[PDB]
């Protein structure tokens with residue numbers, strides 16, 4: 350494990366063959382309300398566009414998944430609710446170790462009044478994408494599929 | 502966009518603030534057969550473990566998503582089938598531009614006889630994970646949720 354770079358949100362290392370990008374673990378929050386899912390959008394310079402996503406972020410030091418989940422929901426949408434741990438996944442285990450912890454939010458309450466809050470019915474997000482009008486981050490897609498799988 | 506590294510499967514660059522890992526687009530194949538989903542496992546040095554995944558890989562030069570999908574299914578499981586484009590997503594648009602194209606495979610036929618082929622019912626993969634016995638890559642999770650959403 351030889352490091353070629355130690356950055357702000359990632360490190361670039363080598364393990365002989367493998368190029369490994371170490372990355373901080375992250376969280377994602379799935380929230381449904383009156384048939385609409387809470388998506389969000391922000392400019393993403395890494396991809397040149399603003400894909401459809403759900404409240405998410407990096408787990409800060411001394412903070413655990415749940416806590417991180419709570420903070421992200423509040424900082425990105427100004428809402429708080431009852432969170433339940435659903436599952437987790439490695440974004441791309443082929444080169445990075447970024448692991449995302451997904452949560453479900455219920456009984457959302459306005460606790461606060463350029464990260465666009467986008468309430469939208471999962472069915473329409475799915476249609477817009479199939480029509481090529483909008484893109485998906487892993488979180489957005491997982492939010493939609495999860496919904497179609499367990500929240501209808 | 503200043504490059505700090507140009508590697509084999511990724512490039513590390515800077516856009517003033519942003520640390521950007523350019524990555525080749527990838528494909529993923531969802532296949533169900535007699536209630537079992539076709540998962541796969543391989544050692545992943547980037548994460549130190551072998552998460553539950555579905556046939557996937559990098560799109561080679563001159564190859565399009567579908568073609569890549571076909572090749573991966575065949576090289577990793579020795580099967581071929583009827584593939585349909587489902588949707589796509591950016592693994593982690595926060596730092597990388599890796600985009601994955603997900604396909605569904607049907608009417609799988611053995612076209613060929615350390616990437617472990619793991620046939621397993623999505624319900625059990627889901628239970629094992631909830632029990633903390635197994636991890637998920639984004640592809641594996643998407644495969645499971647997609648199944649629970651549209652293939653039951």
Ligand SMILES: O=C[C@H](O)[C@H](O)[C@H](O)COP(=O)(O)O
Nearest residue numbers: 441442443444527557558559
């Ligand atoms: O998460 C997997 C990504 O596709 C990585 O880029 C990984 O290195 C790809 O490896 P492979 O082609 O063996 O699936």
Ligand SMILES: O=C[C@H](O)[C@H](O)[C@H](O)COP(=O)(O)O
Nearest residue numbers: 375405406407593594595596
């Ligand atoms: O795909 C998003 C990943 O979490 C990236 O690491 C991204 O840089 C995180 O940014 P933020 O905390 O603003 O969501």
Ligand SMILES: [Zn+2]
Nearest residue numbers: 405406407421
């Ligand atoms: Zn954030």
Ligand SMILES: [Zn+2]
Nearest residue numbers: 407408409410
């Ligand atoms: Zn931070």
Ligand SMILES: [Zn+2]
Nearest residue numbers: 557558559573
């Ligand atoms: Zn491959």
Ligand SMILES: [Zn+2]
Nearest residue numbers: 559560561562
């Ligand atoms: Zn290759």
